[PDB]
Symmetry: D2
Subunit: 286 residues, 4 copies
């Protein structure tokens, strides 16, 4: 029963569907325990946390691969993955799609940002002409070996070209075979409503903190006809503050005593780890 199918089922069963970002395998396991139906691997998340570098397109397909693998082996929730521009031309996009299907990843999102650029370039927010993204999607859809796997198109056109330009690109992207649409940086509930009505496929709302977008509630979004609510980064920002706090209190106090009330207990780890199931499996066989 395929990962793609698990993801499509989850969108049909919960409206809007909450999907939370995880930076580690264990994070995902927790997200599962808490009752979510889908998890997300952020591209900038891979780069900052796993690699220790800014989100400047330094991140390679394999970097994202090793994380995506660790995660789908650890949870049985469908995982959605940020694959930037696909890391190259039509043949590379193809390799990408195939690699991430094989990794057991359930849905995937491609974006209409300029790709590789001019050695000395500084790093900005340009789009590609609609026919250039249409090419990308076409390559992706043809490379796809199992139709249940979800190919989602992400667009940041709205910011520079206005929301109508964005809607018109989006329709061309569904034309080219994209299953769902991720419109970046919408300012109002109405923006979403209009978008959903125009493109007529499932839509994702990126609920990002410290951005421009307000942090809309599940109900707000349900009323707006949005299909997917995405909390991409909260988890790791929360965990990174907790970790800095630990380090500071150890360096200041000469002991970590003051920070132990902010820790998870061993029994809670074993519980989430499904640790008791092993001693169990060992019995059942022997």
């Amino acid at each position: 029963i395929s990962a793609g199918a698990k993801f499509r089922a989850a969108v049909a069963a919960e409206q809007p569907l909450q999907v939370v970002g995880a930076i580690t395998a264990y994070a995902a396991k927790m997200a599962e325990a808490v009752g979510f139906k889908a998890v997300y691997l952020s591209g900038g998340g891979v780069a900052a946390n796993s690699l220790g570098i800014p989100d400047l397109g330094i991140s390679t397909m394999d970097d994202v691969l090793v994380d995506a693998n660790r995660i789908t082996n650890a949870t049985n929730l469908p995982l959605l993955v940020d694959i930037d521009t696909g890391w190259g031309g039509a043949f590379n996009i193809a390799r990408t799609i195939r690699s991430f299907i094989k990794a057991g990843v359930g849905a995937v999102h491609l974006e209409d940002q300029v790709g590789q650029k001019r050695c000395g370039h500084r790093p900005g927010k340009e789009c590609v002409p609609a026919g250039e993204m249409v090419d990308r999607i076409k390559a992706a859809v043809d490379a796809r070996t199992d139709e249940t796997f979800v190919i989602m198109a992400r667009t940041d056109a709205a910011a520079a070209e206005g929301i109508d330009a964005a809607i018109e690109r989006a329709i061309a992207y569904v034309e080219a075979g994209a299953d769902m649409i991720f419109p970046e940086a919408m300012k109002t509930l109405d923006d979403y409503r209009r978008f959903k009505e125009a493109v007529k496929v499932p839509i994702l709302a990126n609920l990002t903190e410290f951005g421009s977008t307000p942090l809309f509630t599940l109900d707000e979004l349900k009323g707006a006809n949005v299909d997917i609510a995405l909390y991409c980064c909260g988890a790791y920002r929360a965990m990174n503050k907790a970790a800095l706090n630990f380090y500071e209190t150890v360096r200041r106090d000469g002991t970590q005593k003051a920070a132990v009330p902010t820790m998870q207990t061993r029994a809670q780890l074993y519980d989430y780890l499904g640790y008791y199931a092993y001693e169990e499996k060992l019995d059942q066989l022997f």
Copy 2:
């Protein structure tokens, strides 16, 4: 440019006892460096639970630890200490292990006297091998070592089942076999450490682990006991896991993360520690023509 091993030896000479903190990600290590620590640690059970999502039952392979170890040494220039369990096999494998982690740019490593591969259906759980068998393990590691500044540290769990004196005996044999430093597990009093340092005469590590049997000794207490290294191996990631769980729960409960944002690290903060503007300042210095 100085070797990772030399950096670690220098750090022990320079700070007594030396605080060394565990990090489960590259970024965590970066933060530890920013806060002023001189050395960082990669915990074996840390790799297994966090990176892989599985208990510490020796399922973790050398390669699992390798990818994490590489990501970390690439991201900080503080010397890193790595838990390498039993070395993942016989003398030939211990050799490959040693070579691999040297090349990875690590500065120190620690092998334990735990029993290697049990029977297939065996239960999980602690047990040491004969002393004479760990001596073999160390011998293979010392031999494979290509650069003497690289630190090989021997870890023993013998104290718990054979008493402290037996453990001290083993440790002397382990220094004989070439071990540079000793990591004695599960000491209950400051005296235990004092005696141990006295007997083995090489640098000694204290594992300050929370929710264990070991009390959480202070830097002073340990300095007075003549301990060389204070190791906070797991705190960081336990803290971070709680914060994560809390995020997830408040999102599922409230239909928004609003309530949780005060518990997050800002973006401006992320960029400070991410060295972010130093990148912009390179593209300019390299390609601006004015």
Copy 3:
């Protein structure tokens, strides 16, 4: 939508005995398919000596084999059989192994009943576990298997030290434990194979390896013996390794490779088997 496992079982049914050839690299496997074989093999010692440059002394890790296995199943559509030695550890590790190789798109996997790790300074020799320890190994594997089409094959080296009948008895116990097929190491006669197939009643593999004890039996000989799989595990790489040494030698001797160019596959043939022109079509068929 046919899984690597089902492709392999189908290929056993369709060709008897089935010829299955070893490949050390992705390209090798592409050739093997072009030549018309229905299945390919990734040899454990093959990984170790060629990819890693080290002897077959159990140094090779599960990930070493994984990366090669991945490259190969990405590059051909034939089902692949992989040597996974002892499974790289206890029941939990055997499980991780089975799951990892399933995901890698491998069709079939053989495990052997050798001992795992022993004393640190133990010399490289050959030893068997109790028939019971290997039953546990198989049980772990079968349980971890998520798709029954995936073939779990048990290999035994018992014959050598305990005689043919002990080995037969083990094998029946391994089928008991869930093993789909059996790989009996080092048989001397066509009769050995015949009796073995008769007793174990599941598909049987014959390891046709060069420079060993085993004679190089022909397809017909094996057909008449009731053998299901003929395995040529290493020929390919020994052939290519000599070719390579020869090239290095002639270059160091002559100060040019001119003498060696007749042994080389042409830039042009390479390009064809990699199916380079099929990419042009795609670009055209897309844009």
Copy 4:
């Protein structure tokens, strides 16, 4: 002693220096046994052999990484690696240089070609503004943490812009910090002679079979003042034919009998692989 230093030493000690490509760790070991002072990792070599796909810039930095690691672990000769255009902008080139330093490689070669392009664009080599390749090199030189590591600039300009334009670019590339230059597709011995005299740094000659370039002798190149003779692909073309031949004889004859005189023996594999040396250490350590 760094692998950068080993490589620079080797160029000073043997002129011109012969350097041969290896597609596997074992191949490299053989190359060393035969007496070569350096080996080469071909970009197209990684793509075709390890991956099973054409040299159309599909190959990633990691693909080349895993092969590069396997090789430098298995031989102690300095290795030279084809790194194409560096796999992205200035920050990617930087990551690339750092990665290949830490992998123990000794010299890298960057080339002034185009990358990447419009999703749909067909294969066909085109160069960039010289201004752009200078930026690439600057990025590399800056990211380099150990001077002894050799950064080599490769250009394909001669083919479309004439030999003079190429010499001009080359001088600008040495300006930008490039240590040595690799001028693609020279037709005559004189082309090389003029180039070395113009750029005044060490020069590489790509001795490629089935190409345009004649297969020049060590002497011919010595007389032309060339520093490095590069046999990048011979080895694996030779080994690929031997392998196809194996597969064909097996499918034809129903046995490999006819092929075994092509094969490198078991006894020979063990030599080349250090083998006994493992046993000798167990004695060293535990007797």
